[PDB]
């Protein structure tokens, strides 16, 4: 229902008798209960809530010289410089966003991470499972959107929300 973000006439916060519990009471009708009552006026319905508890996104890991662990099935000692790093991730954004290089086949062929198994597609996860910057950017993008260069533990990652 309404977003109840106020206290109209009659409603007043009070503490329990000789106690320390705080509640809400309305003298207009002598009401008494927890949680906010109304929302100033009366009519309210500008809420939302809900949203999917999980999301399906794909990504492309491209370690660099500053990678905490420059090594994977793609290479033994990764050392992608600043330009080399973004050069890959960025270039990948162009082709993919253009529809020439499918992120799926793209990530896999360049997925420095074990994501290759799913061509970068990490699958349906829950907000708070993957890296903080990952989840945020991931959960911050729209359906079919691709994130930019994300510098995390390994290196630069590119996210692409599927659904």
UniProtKB/Swiss-Prot annotation:
GO terms for molecular function: beta-catenin binding; cis-trans isomerase activity; cytoskeletal motor activity; GTPase activating protein binding; mitogen-activated protein kinase kinase binding; peptidyl-prolyl cis-trans isomerase activity; phosphoprotein binding; phosphoserine residue binding. GO terms for biological process: cellular response to hypoxia; negative regulation of amyloid-beta formation; negative regulation of cell motility; negative regulation of ERK1 and ERK2 cascade; negative regulation of protein binding; negative regulation of protein catabolic process; negative regulation of SMAD protein signal transduction; negative regulation of transforming growth factor beta receptor signaling pathway. One of its GO terms (cellular component) is glutamatergic synapse. The modification N6-acetyllysine is found at residue 46. Keywords: Acetylation, Cell cycle, Cytoplasm, Isomerase, Nucleus, Phosphoprotein, Rotamase. Transmembrane segments: none annotated. The modification Phosphoserine is found at residues 43, 71, 108. Disulfide bonds: none annotated. Residues 52-163 form the PpiC domain. The keyword NAD does not apply. Its EC number is 5.2.1.8. PROSITE patterns: PPIC_PPIASE_1, PPIC_PPIASE_2, WW_DOMAIN_1, WW_DOMAIN_2. It catalyses: [protein]-peptidylproline (omega=180) = [protein]-peptidylproline (omega=0). Expressed in immune cells in the lung (at protein level). The phosphorylated form at Ser-71 is expressed in normal breast tissue cells but not in breast cancer cells. It comes from the Eukaryota. Its main location: nucleus. Changing residue 34 to A: Loss of binding to phosphorylated target proteins, including to phosphorylated RBBP8/CtIP; decrease in DNA repair of double-strand breaks by homologous recombination less efficient than that observed with wild-type protein. Residues 33-54 are annotated as: Disordered. Residues 5-39 form the WW domain. The WW domain is required for the interaction with STIL and KIF20B. Interacts with STIL. Interacts with KIF20B. Interacts with NEK6. Interacts (via WW domain) with PRKX. Interacts with BTK. Interacts (via PpiC domain) with DAPK1. Interacts with the phosphorylated form of RAF1. Interacts (via WW domain) with ATCAY; upon NGF stimulation. Interacts with PML (isoform PML-4). Interacts with BCL6. Interacts with FBXW7, disrupting FBXW7 dimerization and promoting FBXW7 autoubiquitination and degradation. Directly interacts with RBBP8/CtIP; this interaction depends upon RBBP8 phosphorylation. This is Peptidyl-prolyl cis-trans isomerase NIMA-interacting 1.
């Amino acid at each position: 229902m309404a977003d109840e973000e106020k206290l109209p006439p009659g409603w007043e916060k009070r503490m329990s008798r000789s106690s320390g519990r705080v509640y809400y009471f309305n003298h207009i009708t002598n009401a008494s209960q927890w949680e906010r009552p109304s929302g100033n006026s009366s009519s309210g319905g500008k809420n939302g809530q809900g949203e999917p508890a999980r999301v399906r996104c794909s990504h492309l890991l491209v370690k660099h010289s500053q990678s905490r662990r420059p090594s994977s099935w793609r290479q033994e000692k990764i050392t992608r410089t600043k330009e080399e790093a973004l050069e890959l991730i960025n270039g990948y954004i162009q082709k993919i966003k253009s529809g020439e290089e499918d992120f799926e086949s793209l990530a896999s062929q360049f997925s420095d991470c074990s994501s290759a198994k799913a061509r970068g597609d990490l699958g349906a996860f829950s907000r708070g499972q993957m890296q903080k910057p990952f989840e945020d950017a991931s959960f911050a993008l729209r359906t079919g959107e691709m994130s930019g260069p994300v510098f995390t533990d390994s290196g630069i990652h590119i996210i692409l929300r599927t659904e």
